[PDB]
RNA sequence: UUGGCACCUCGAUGUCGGCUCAUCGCAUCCUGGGGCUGUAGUCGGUCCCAAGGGUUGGGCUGUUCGCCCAUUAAAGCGGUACGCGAGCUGGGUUCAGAACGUCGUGAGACAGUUCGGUCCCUAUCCGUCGCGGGCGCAGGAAAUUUGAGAGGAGCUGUCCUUA
RNA sequence: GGAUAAGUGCUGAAAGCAUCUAAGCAUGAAGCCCCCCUCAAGAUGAGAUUUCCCAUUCCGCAAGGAAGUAAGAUCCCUGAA
């Protein structure tokens, strides 16, 4: 993961979603995988 | 689950098909007897009593006499209570003996530790002492009682008191030998308590 | 110069079901009647209340994520002797005590508060051993 | 553009029953199913065709209205045709077998691995490597498939381990 | 932490370090569980959850700290009056002696140095650890017990096989 | 063992797709509750079970009181595990 408050998409395929009230980022590229905390 | 209770005698050495010594503890368990057979319908749990003695009538009392006279036996001195066993097996007036066990069954044993008396922090709690030289006026003492802020002393701070007399169990022992003719158990090792004292033996709680 | 009661009391026995109820809004009434504020013959120092029975304590309700997030803390007088129990497992294992805690909290404090707590008698399920007292039902105003 | 708004035919060899308020039960050749649904919803089976409705338009009712139809479509598709998932696996000593109904795996460990489809699902081993889960509920089928895949999930360097047939494995360069 | 302000304390709140005694936080040193990797493996880096337990012995220095030797799974960071002197020591700082350098006309002085230099108190209350007595528990007694609830314990390596 | 953290997910819409999530399901830690050991009914909420004793005498209108006892225990004595 990349835990950080400044959560963004990186590439166009990065897809922001929300989960358990938290913000997260999805992509096939796991390095683009993010979460707030 | 199983169990028996008798009296400790002492310790000695025993060989095992080898030169291999065994430090042994010796117990006599004259045939114990059932006295009462409890139930969840009335007693809230399933369990039995066991008596180990043959007292004098000059020592016993009427209620004891009745409580045993349910069975066809005499008053008893060491009566205790086993739990979590097979109940349909047992009955009242039923004697239990050492040939329950065998020479390889593991065991948890239980007794009452020796009385050491009002002893200090070191012997009781294994603390370290202060230096005996270099100007020290401090040794054999417990230590500080705590910090300053809470204006008090926390619980659990360890201090002198009557060391001993505690109910102690020892797990995963191993039976070595049986002499049902002498009503004797020979157990690998050492147990809590002094000679002539009660010892309740149990199938090990694995 | 009004009356101030003393040994001129008639303590009835009430019964309360809790099949869908919020314990707070329920308890805020049961404690009031345990104190006797539902009576004209109220005095603050006499325990004019009325005995209470509660049934189906397990079957209470809550709002929000309390079952997961509401925490009953409790400290011993030992260091690090803090302990915690969620409302959920309290409800499962023993809802008697969590009802008792709420009601005790909203009762007055002192000997009289304790003695009016002693009238309370909470029971899981719908059994009610206290048939002999010939109680009656009390619906909740709330 | 909406899911729950649509309708679901009921071809044949099927029987739907509102046993109560919402506890639907379905039957057919592959077997049967049941589900309980949210009661604010409204369900009405007409001749050969099923309709769904919600009272309102909220974030809740909308989502439920979609999920109910999609789930019921899954149910009937399973009772008619059943659901199936394949699983490949890639190695050298990697293989499978069965001990009766159970599944057995010789992949990469000092020990083998055992799996039990207890729940009226069956498993098929047409080859030493390839595997099929086969049942009626997508939920349980995918669950078991993931239980399998978690055993020896693949690796990126050499694509190893259990692997859904339609999987796109990520790759690395072993330095 | 260095500090700033002077709010309690100058009809006295004893001040560094060390010993004994521990205790708490977690921003985790190890152990546990995971994500990502410029992760081949073995080892690692980084991040996340986790404070249950554990977290060495010596040389030098009064020392803290630090360097060094050898180990360890690891040799954690901090708070508790930089925890704890009515529990200990008193080596240093910080009285009176004397001396060196330096300053001063001089008496003398120096976060400059060096040698040596009195650590009192029968525990009333609370608190803590143990032990007894009294009464209560709708009659009086002997035994066995339930368990609310409390406390304890809770660490880890190396080797063989898999290979 | 049970429930969980981070994590992993299955099914799945809102948002015709995708989605571990809102509904609903499952996993998942030396950690939490248990399992292990000890204390424990002053738990004034004072519990439970078995067994023993009997329901005597005086006043006192009753209330109640004392005054000998049963079962039993102690004082006292020999001693220590």
mmCIF file of C-alpha atoms (C1' of nucleotides) in Angstrom, chain B residues 38 45 49 64 79-81 83 124 127-128 134-138 142-144 147-149 153-157 159-162, chain E residues 19-23 80-81 83-85 87-90 119-121 126-132 141-147:
data_model
loop_
_atom_site.group_PDB
_atom_site.id
_atom_site.type_symbol
_atom_site.label_atom_id
_atom_site.label_comp_id
_atom_site.label_asym_id
_atom_site.label_seq_id
_atom_site.Cartn_x
_atom_site.Cartn_y
_atom_site.Cartn_z
ATOM 1 C CA UNK B 38 -23.726 -34.631 41.961
ATOM 2 C CA UNK B 45 -22.820 -29.513 37.729
ATOM 3 C CA UNK B 49 -16.884 -36.840 46.011
ATOM 4 C CA UNK B 64 -20.401 -36.889 58.609
ATOM 5 C CA UNK B 79 -12.854 -35.623 51.339
ATOM 6 C CA UNK B 80 -12.664 -33.784 48.053
ATOM 7 C CA UNK B 81 -14.507 -33.512 44.805
ATOM 8 C CA UNK B 83 -15.267 -32.731 38.204
ATOM 9 C CA UNK B 124 9.139 -15.045 48.781
ATOM 10 C CA UNK B 127 14.035 -10.305 44.342
ATOM 11 C CA UNK B 128 17.637 -9.214 44.257
ATOM 12 C CA UNK B 134 30.753 -0.226 49.510
ATOM 13 C CA UNK B 135 28.996 1.697 52.235
ATOM 14 C CA UNK B 136 25.563 0.234 51.688
ATOM 15 C CA UNK B 137 23.104 0.261 54.545
ATOM 16 C CA UNK B 138 20.633 -1.503 52.259
ATOM 17 C CA UNK B 142 12.138 -5.091 48.907
ATOM 18 C CA UNK B 143 12.899 -1.951 46.959
ATOM 19 C CA UNK B 144 11.129 1.262 46.234
ATOM 20 C CA UNK B 147 6.914 6.854 42.027
ATOM 21 C CA UNK B 148 5.725 10.104 43.517
ATOM 22 C CA UNK B 149 2.917 11.433 41.312
ATOM 23 C CA UNK B 153 1.332 2.655 46.249
ATOM 24 C CA UNK B 154 0.069 0.475 43.462
ATOM 25 C CA UNK B 155 -1.394 -2.896 44.141
ATOM 26 C CA UNK B 156 0.609 -5.962 43.356
ATOM 27 C CA UNK B 157 3.779 -4.529 44.806
ATOM 28 C CA UNK B 159 6.270 -7.675 50.058
ATOM 29 C CA UNK B 160 6.885 -10.039 52.963
ATOM 30 C CA UNK B 161 4.183 -12.357 54.168
ATOM 31 C CA UNK B 162 3.330 -15.900 55.011
ATOM 32 C "C1'" C E 19 21.590 0.067 43.235
ATOM 33 C "C1'" U E 20 16.806 -2.227 44.473
ATOM 34 C "C1'" C E 21 11.744 -1.908 42.907
ATOM 35 C "C1'" A E 22 8.856 -1.631 39.214
ATOM 36 C "C1'" U E 23 4.894 0.730 36.329
ATOM 37 C "C1'" U E 80 6.258 8.595 36.127
ATOM 38 C "C1'" A E 81 9.410 15.623 40.870
ATOM 39 C "C1'" G E 83 10.314 7.855 38.687
ATOM 40 C "C1'" C E 84 12.148 6.115 43.329
ATOM 41 C "C1'" G E 85 17.791 9.452 49.128
ATOM 42 C "C1'" G E 87 14.377 2.826 50.456
ATOM 43 C "C1'" C E 88 20.476 2.639 49.810
ATOM 44 C "C1'" U E 89 25.082 4.846 48.094
ATOM 45 C "C1'" G E 90 27.354 9.688 47.786
ATOM 46 C "C1'" C E 119 23.508 11.778 54.454
ATOM 47 C "C1'" C E 120 19.282 12.506 61.119
ATOM 48 C "C1'" C E 121 14.119 10.586 62.079
ATOM 49 C "C1'" C E 126 -4.014 6.826 53.936
ATOM 50 C "C1'" G E 127 -1.717 3.320 50.796
ATOM 51 C "C1'" U E 128 0.642 -1.720 49.997
ATOM 52 C "C1'" C E 129 1.746 -7.057 51.617
ATOM 53 C "C1'" G E 130 0.254 -10.801 55.090
ATOM 54 C "C1'" C E 131 -2.635 -12.332 59.447
ATOM 55 C "C1'" G E 132 -6.592 -12.649 63.235
ATOM 56 C "C1'" A E 141 -24.176 -26.801 63.204
ATOM 57 C "C1'" A E 142 -20.065 -30.087 60.234
ATOM 58 C "C1'" A E 143 -18.392 -30.839 55.324
ATOM 59 C "C1'" U E 144 -18.003 -30.391 49.983
ATOM 60 C "C1'" U E 145 -18.740 -26.779 46.304
ATOM 61 C "C1'" U E 146 -20.586 -23.122 42.081
ATOM 62 C "C1'" G E 147 -18.657 -19.112 40.013
#
